[PDB]
Amino acid sequence: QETQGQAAARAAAADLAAGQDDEPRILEAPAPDARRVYVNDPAHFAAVTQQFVIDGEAGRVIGMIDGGFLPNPVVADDGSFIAHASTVFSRIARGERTDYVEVFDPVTLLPTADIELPDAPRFLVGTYPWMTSLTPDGKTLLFYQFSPAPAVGVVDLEGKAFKRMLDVPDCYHIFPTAPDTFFMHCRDGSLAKVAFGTEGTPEITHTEVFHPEDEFLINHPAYSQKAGRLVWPTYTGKIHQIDLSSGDAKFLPAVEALTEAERADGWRPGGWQQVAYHRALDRIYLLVDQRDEWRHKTASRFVVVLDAKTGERLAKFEMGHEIDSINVSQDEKPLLYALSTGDKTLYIHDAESGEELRSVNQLGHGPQVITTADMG
Amino acid sequence: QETQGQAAARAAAADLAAGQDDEPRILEAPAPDARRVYVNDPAHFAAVTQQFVIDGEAGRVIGMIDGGFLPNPVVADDGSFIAHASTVFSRIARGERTDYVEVFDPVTLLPTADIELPDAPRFLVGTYPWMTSLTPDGKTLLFYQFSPAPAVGVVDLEGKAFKRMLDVPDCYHIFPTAPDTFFMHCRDGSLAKVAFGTEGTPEITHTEVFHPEDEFLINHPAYSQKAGRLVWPTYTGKIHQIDLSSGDAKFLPAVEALTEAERADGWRPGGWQQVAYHRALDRIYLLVDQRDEWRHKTASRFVVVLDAKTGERLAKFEMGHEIDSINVSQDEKPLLYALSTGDKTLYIHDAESGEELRSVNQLGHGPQVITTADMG
Amino acid sequence: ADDALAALGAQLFVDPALSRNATQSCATCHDPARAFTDPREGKAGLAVSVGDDGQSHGDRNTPTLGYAALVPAFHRDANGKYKGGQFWDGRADDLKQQAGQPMLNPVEMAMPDRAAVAARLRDDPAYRTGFEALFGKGVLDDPERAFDAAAEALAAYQATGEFSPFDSKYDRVMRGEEKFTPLEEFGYTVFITWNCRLCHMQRKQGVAERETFTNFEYHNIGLPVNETAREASGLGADHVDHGLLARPGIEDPAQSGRFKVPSLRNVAVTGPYMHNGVFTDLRTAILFYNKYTSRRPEAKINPETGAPWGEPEVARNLSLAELQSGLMLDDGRVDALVAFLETLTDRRYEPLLE
Amino acid sequence: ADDALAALGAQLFVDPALSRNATQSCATCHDPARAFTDPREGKAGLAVSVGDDGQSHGDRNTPTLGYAALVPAFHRDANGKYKGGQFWDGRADDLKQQAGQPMLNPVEMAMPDRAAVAARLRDDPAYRTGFEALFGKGVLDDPERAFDAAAEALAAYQATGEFSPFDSKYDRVMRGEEKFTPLEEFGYTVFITWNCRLCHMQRKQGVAERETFTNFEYHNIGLPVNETAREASGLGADHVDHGLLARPGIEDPAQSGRFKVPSLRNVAVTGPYMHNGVFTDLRTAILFYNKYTSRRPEAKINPETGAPWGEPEVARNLSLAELQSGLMLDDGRVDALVAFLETLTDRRYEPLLEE
Amino acid sequence: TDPRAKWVPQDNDIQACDYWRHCSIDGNICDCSGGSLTNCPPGTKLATASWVASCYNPTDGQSYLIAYRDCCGYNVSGRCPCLNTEGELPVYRPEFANDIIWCFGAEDDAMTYHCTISPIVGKAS
Amino acid sequence: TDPRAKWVPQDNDIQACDYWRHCSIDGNICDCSGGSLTNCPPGTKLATASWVASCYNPTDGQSYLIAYRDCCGYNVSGRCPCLNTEGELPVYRPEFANDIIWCFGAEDDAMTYHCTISPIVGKAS
Ligand code: HEC
Ligand code: HEC
Ligand code: HEC
Ligand code: HEC
Ligand SMILES: [Ca+2]
Ligand SMILES: [Ca+2]
Ligand code: NA
Ligand code: NA
Ligand code: NA
Numbered sequence A, B: 001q002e003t004q005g006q007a008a009a010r011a012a013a014a015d016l017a018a019g020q021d022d023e024p025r026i027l028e029a030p031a032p033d034a035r036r037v038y039v040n041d042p043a044h045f046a047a048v049t050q051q052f053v054i055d056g057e058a059g060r061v062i063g064m065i066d067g068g069f070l071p072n073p074v075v076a077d078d079g080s081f082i083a084h085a086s087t088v089f090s091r092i093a094r095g096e097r098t099d100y101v102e103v104f105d106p107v108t109l110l111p112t113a114d115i116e117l118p119d120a121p122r123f124l125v126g127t128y129p130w131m132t133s134l135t136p137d138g139k140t141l142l143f144y145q146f147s148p149a150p151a152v153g154v155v156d157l158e159g160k161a162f163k164r165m166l167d168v169p170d171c172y173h174i175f176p177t178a179p180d181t182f183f184m185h186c187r188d189g190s191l192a193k194v195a196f197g198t199e200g201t202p203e204i205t206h207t208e209v210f211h212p213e214d215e216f217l218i219n220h221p222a223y224s225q226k227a228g229r230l231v232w233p234t235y236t237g238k239i240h241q242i243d244l245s246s247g248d249a250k251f252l253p254a255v256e257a258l259t260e261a262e263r264a265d266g267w268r269p270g271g272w273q274q275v276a277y278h279r280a281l282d283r284i285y286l287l288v289d290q291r292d293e294w295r296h297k298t299a300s301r302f303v304v305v306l307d308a309k310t311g312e313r314l315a316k317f318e319m320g321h322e323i324d325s326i327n328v329s330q331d332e333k334p335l336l337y338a339l340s341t342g343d344k345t346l347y348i349h350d351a352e353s354g355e356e357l358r359s360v361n362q363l364g365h366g367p368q369v370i371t372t373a374d375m376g
Numbered sequence C: 001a002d003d004a005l006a007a008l009g010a011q012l013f014v015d016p017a018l019s020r021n022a023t024q025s026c027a028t029c030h031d032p033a034r035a036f037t038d039p040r041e042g043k044a045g046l047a048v049s050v051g052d053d054g055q056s057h058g059d060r061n062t063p064t065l066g067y068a069a070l071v072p073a074f075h076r077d078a079n080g081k082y083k084g085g086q087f088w089d090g091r092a093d094d095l096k097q098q099a100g101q102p103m104l105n106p107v108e109m110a111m112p113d114r115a116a117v118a119a120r121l122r123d124d125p126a127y128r129t130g131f132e133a134l135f136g137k138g139v140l141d142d143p144e145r146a147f148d149a150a151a152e153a154l155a156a157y158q159a160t161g162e163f164s165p166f167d168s169k170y171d172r173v174m175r176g177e178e179k180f181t182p183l184e185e186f187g188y189t190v191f192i193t194w195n196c197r198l199c200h201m202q203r204k205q206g207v208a209e210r211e212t213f214t215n216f217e218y219h220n221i222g223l224p225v226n227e228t229a230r231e232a233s234g235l236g237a238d239h240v241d242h243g244l245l246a247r248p249g250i251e252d253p254a255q256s257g258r259f260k261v262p263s264l265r266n267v268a269v270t271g272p273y274m275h276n277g278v279f280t281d282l283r284t285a286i287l288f289y290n291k292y293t294s295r296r297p298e299a300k301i302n303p304e305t306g307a308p309w310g311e312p313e314v315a316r317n318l319s320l321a322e323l324q325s326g327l328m329l330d331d332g333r334v335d336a337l338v339a340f341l342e343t344l345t346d347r348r349y350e351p352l353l354e
Numbered sequence D: 001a002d003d004a005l006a007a008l009g010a011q012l013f014v015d016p017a018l019s020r021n022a023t024q025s026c027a028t029c030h031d032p033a034r035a036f037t038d039p040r041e042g043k044a045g046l047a048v049s050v051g052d053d054g055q056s057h058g059d060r061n062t063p064t065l066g067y068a069a070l071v072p073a074f075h076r077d078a079n080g081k082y083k084g085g086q087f088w089d090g091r092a093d094d095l096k097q098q099a100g101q102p103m104l105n106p107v108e109m110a111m112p113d114r115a116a117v118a119a120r121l122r123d124d125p126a127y128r129t130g131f132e133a134l135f136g137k138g139v140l141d142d143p144e145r146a147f148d149a150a151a152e153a154l155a156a157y158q159a160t161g162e163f164s165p166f167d168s169k170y171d172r173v174m175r176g177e178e179k180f181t182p183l184e185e186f187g188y189t190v191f192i193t194w195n196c197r198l199c200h201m202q203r204k205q206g207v208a209e210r211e212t213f214t215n216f217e218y219h220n221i222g223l224p225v226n227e228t229a230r231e232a233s234g235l236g237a238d239h240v241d242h243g244l245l246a247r248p249g250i251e252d253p254a255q256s257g258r259f260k261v262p263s264l265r266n267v268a269v270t271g272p273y274m275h276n277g278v279f280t281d282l283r284t285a286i287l288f289y290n291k292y293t294s295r296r297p298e299a300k301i302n303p304e305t306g307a308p309w310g311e312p313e314v315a316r317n318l319s320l321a322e323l324q325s326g327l328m329l330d331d332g333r334v335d336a337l338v339a340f341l342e343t344l345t346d347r348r349y350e351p352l353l354e355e
Numbered sequence E, F: 001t002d003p004r005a006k007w008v009p010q011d012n013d014i015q016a017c018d019y020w021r022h023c024s025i026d027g028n029i030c031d032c033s034g035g036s037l038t039n040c041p042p043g044t045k046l047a048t049a050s051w052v053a054s055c056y057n058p059t060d061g062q063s064y065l066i067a068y069r070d071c072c073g074y075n076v077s078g079r080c081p082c083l084n085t086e087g088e089l090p091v092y093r094p095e096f097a098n099d100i101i102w103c104f105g106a107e108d109d110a111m112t113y114h115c116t117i118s119p120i121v122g123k124a125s
């Protein structure tokens, strides 16, 4: 029941009473672990933004990272580093644009690489986790470009240099599967495999169309690079699962997150990060609520949990708050993270019981994106 | 009683019905007038900030201006231009610091000058209006430097160039009185008159000491350049008045904003911009409330109005809100401006009756500074 | 009377007696079977039309007469932008002032003067009847009155519902009578969200009562010379088409190289394209706009030639603000635009789509 | 025992019989009338001290012995920072290891060896009684035992209240017996808000029981050579005082030029200043720090000479992080700091404050 | 106020988030920062790009195409924030997508979001 | 909670604005963004400059000098904002003035305000 602030007050009183000296210094964040959670605040399109580095178990902010206009955060699964692609201007929001990649040490938070992206090539959009992506080996960062056309930038983090833009078809999002390979979702309804050697035009293969034109796949699918699992829900909560572990796309049996009776009762997924995927447990988590069909970006008060293999519901939680985004830790007995944009608060739940354990408030102006490293 | 938003809905509806066409374009702000009011938002020390340009008569936002870290706003009294001194960094709040002055067209709000200030010379402080100041002719901007020592930067707005730093004594604030002359308030309890050239040590002359070391003169005195009147409250609401209209300092009788009984009962000034001065009316407005002596930065809910000549109280307004800053328009039948940092709302009052007339909300994160032009 | 006036213009429109050697009428170059354009293959293909002498070619593509009646008289609006008038360069104030000009154009119908026109009208008993009933006895004996009256009849004729039926698929879909196909709806959506609608819509905002997919403004979109058409024109390789700057009274150098925004109605059936008919295909006309947006090497290449588009005839006054939109049209979006523009075909021209 | 050991040290401290020519005691260079410093004029003014031979000059200024007993024994803390010891370079671990060295130093007291020292102690009947009562019979017969015991005695004497009275105005103010003047209080506030507190306060944070205005650390503040002192010492134009690197066992080149932070107690009366006594005036020592912060031309000029401060003797490992504060001390704050430092004078030396 | 409830358009106040023309608006209403319904505030730059929605007008029972254009080159206004998604589709259908910063074509290559205007560019269908 | 009421120090929670050491704090408590009471959060830079206040400790009845130090180089944390002014004097007495961004001496010339630490430097007098 003793809060972190109270324990700190007693320790400081004990130090003063015992005459214990200590040097004012710059703290190091604790070593990255399974329970570390990052919360990004795109700040409702503000020119500058903030990332919050949080200890999930303590419910404590252990560090922060400044960003520019709608940055894309990435977190290496092995915990070795974090990074973002960011955007600044020479006069706040006006003048010369500089797009750039920064890599940070994950305990000092110090920038270890600052890589300028030529010709201001970043896609400026409400933050989608998979618009910027690390390759599994972590030596390459891939970012999406919309203007003048869909394109994918190759950033070498090892050599700390921009390499080139890749011409792609009318496709969206970046799901890396190998050092030289990533998948995209295309307007025509297919996925595009993009294989890029160190030189030339990439080899682009399409799969067969896997969803009809009238079936809308959300902007925030879950992707486990280590499982090669792409979990893509539709506006109705229908869930597409694609296995990419063999290096090619294999379409798993489609599953419904809601029942037909619930769908008729107006139950629909809604929010920002509406889906989480736990790799070890092979488990899908979805933000749902009762809502009109075009209120798809509003907060949801419920989470449903289903077996990815069979699509049986394992649980349904009443979250107790207006939740926009969810994610989970990738350790055993995982935490369920429930982020409220409206409350600016990360709510930390036990993923098994759905019970609220603790919370971290005051997370910016409009926090939206939760990132966890898969370290196991 | 019909709101601006309703009136606009009505007009837009009539345009659609009449088949009236219009071209989507960039608006001009209405011409600078006596009831234009500027609200700056230092945003509780955020790296980037906003200024709100407001029509006080309609209670409408007519334009905005982006700024960096704790910029200093100035407004030309004749309405010809606005300017600020501002600070940006190459990576949001970290990296290379650039200090610079911008001058803006008051109707397009476009920058007409961007003048770099060498060696990052700006004083970074919670915004005090008189830490950066225009000469009466509006050709020169003067800014205060604290580090490594008290200094005053001279910026030529006409030539759009930085000129020089001036070494000054242990003094503070800048109150210009002539093309080449300003006054400062000194630690020793005197004022310093600084008469400067393009080169050469400036002619620095101390007035007599005018207050004891245990009277505390607030960081936000009111200064009417056109009247040469400096209105300087102490923590207790005692007001020092200095007449600089002759070009030399003349010390006026001190007045008490609060009665002895009020002072005995805990009445003190408090807030940010605690004092306003109306030139034509020769009236002093002071933010006051019942408070502890060391709660001098908290909001006040009352404004006292007094005759600057006699010290006679003309009114005590109950503001009905938590007010941190006041100021007045400088025309006949002036408006009393009452800004709430907590509510992020500018409350617009009739300065004669004290009655709230209208309000402009959503003014940033922690708006603190009100500026008006004296155009008469 | 207004019916009779049009009826007179209907006669004059198909009358070769208004050409010097009586070989051509308005209908010869404005073929009612090809949306009032010219089907004849000349020295430069369909880019430019052959006059009455059988040899002379123009330097400009013959535009449709469909919906020309909806264009306002030439004027300068409050924004300083010239709008309306007739001809690719707006040198004619309106349909009336334009009508007589082809008649006296030596590279076109080639009548020596108004007198010669009057003489030809006077030779026709039905014209003496038709003109005099409308304009008074002895009208045809006065060359000035006869010429002006003929011009008014043709203008009146051009203003009939027959030239502007508004019965295209677009028009039917906008009356709720049918739906666009998936591809057509995409095309329409692209058209109104991309830079197209900045010039090819009547109004900036609101809904037009009679949309003709042109704002009537003048723009230099930076087109190259049409080599063979310029050759066929005989105006010389030294010649520059200065567009709107050619209108008498227009002196402003900022108008050099600017041309009237054509109406996109019947665009699918009125190729080749642009003021000089340089592009034979509709898809090419669309793809041209990619040269200002796309960074792909293929955007610099005219697909009809496999060579670079070519330098602008007039390198200045390009509408760069509008043209440099920051977004490239992919092949799917080009397909969609073609599909949408095909819906702008009048009912009677729908069989021409194949 | 505690009283007696110290009392024995008291005798040795004033005894010139511990110098070769018997002209010189500890008290000669560490004069109780001058806060245990050397009032004698040499070839380099009061910068360096003249030894027993009457000709040899040292290369370092003679520091106060007052409050030296508060300094911890030499060690390296977990921060990798060396702390404590005795001598400007901390080459002696503590007071006991230090005490005997001036006795054997040929530029100082100049006794040939421990046997010659033992011999002098043996000659005094009072020492035979005093030493044997504390260390056993025949102590003065064993050169090693006698030298070590003399060291012990001298160390014990320097640990008495005599050397660290804590009766300065500052101490009285901290007890609430009196108040600072506005100038002193300003000076105090400046001292604890400016970079001074980073090196001249015992602790990083919290409150010290027995503050002596030093963290006992080693810092190179970038001082020049004292030319007349270096000439007088005879060490050569090519000689470099490496400070802490000179201590045997210290091999780390980053310790070159670093010296022990002196206690600021009695500073107003122990001029001249710094390890080589380069500055005559207290104000001048203070102004030196402005060279790292001020941009004014005057800031790089030594006001005592009218010439630049000078190129650092060791132009590496300077404490730039602490020195480059970004804020210059104006004359008012210098006046204030002078006034504060003067309150650090032990009561018995308050009469010295006028000169 | 029930955020999940079917959106109810009104035609009485352009500054409120339930004004009929804002049916797929994302960001801030420009009328609250010195613009108007269909004009940009001074100092900002008007994009030529747009996202589109068919917004039902309750007044005349007609559905209009609103082509939302951004005013760019300023930090977000922070006044009258609104987010509606009537007929809003995912990013792969960008013409209907409203998370995108449609600042393309703006003068001085301005790409920062300040606010959005709501002009009618046609009748639906 | 009555803002104009006399400040009431406690010694049981360092993240609260009434914590005794925060008597003249202006900005944010570093403990709330990855620092601690007397240490800066990772990635920020410790200023060497400071402002002072005599703060009464209700635990031991002693008044201590708190020399506040800013952690700089980051945008304001936005967590545990507090502003107290016990003994706080105007700018012309800068050693007691808390509006000044006391970032001087910070590594890399960092001068942006992130948060403030509250270490004891002596006893009051
Ligand atoms: C020799 C072929 C030819 C004949 C015969 C001809 N035209 Fe044309 N028409 C053209 C060409 C070429 C242009 C464009 C010339 C230019 O823009 O300078 C044109 C332009 C026009 C325009 C302007 C349309 C627009 O969008 O700007 C109208 C109206 C017109 N003609 C009507 C007529 C009438 C009436 C007649 C019969 C008197 C006629 N034409 C005879 C080829 C011809
Ligand atoms: C800057 C204004 C402007 C913009 C933007 C614009 N156009 Fe045009 N368009 C013109 C003008 C002017 C011409 C005539 C050019 C000439 O011949 O000199 C033209 C010609 C055409 C033609 C040939 C029609 C004919 O009768 O010859 C087609 C087809 C066309 N445009 C389609 C488009 C499409 C599709 C887009 C959007 C991708 C577009 N335009 C963008 C102004 C514009
Ligand atoms: C010739 C003058 C002279 C005499 C005699 C002398 N000293 Fe010193 N003392 C010095 C000098 C010079 C230093 C500093 C030298 C150095 O740092 O290498 C010093 C340093 C010291 C220190 C270290 C102080 C500190 O703060 O680091 C102590 C303790 C000391 N002396 C005590 C004694 C004792 C005990 C005796 C008698 C045995 C004595 N001194 C005799 C000149 C003298
Ligand atoms: C970087 C740590 C550091 C800082 C910061 C510092 N000092 Fe020092 N101080 C020293 C060291 C080390 C010496 C001895 C230098 C030497 O002789 O090599 C010293 C010597 C002195 C002396 C001479 C005392 C004597 O016995 O010779 C005075 C006086 C002094 N400092 C005052 C100050 C004042 C006042 C400030 C604040 C402006 C200050 N110092 C800042 C470490 C520091
Ligand atoms: Ca054509
Ligand atoms: Ca000395
Ligand atoms: Na050709
Ligand atoms: Na002309
Ligand atoms: Na000397």
Ligand code: NA
Pocket: D245, D246, D247, D248, D249, D250, D251
């Ligand atoms: Na050594």
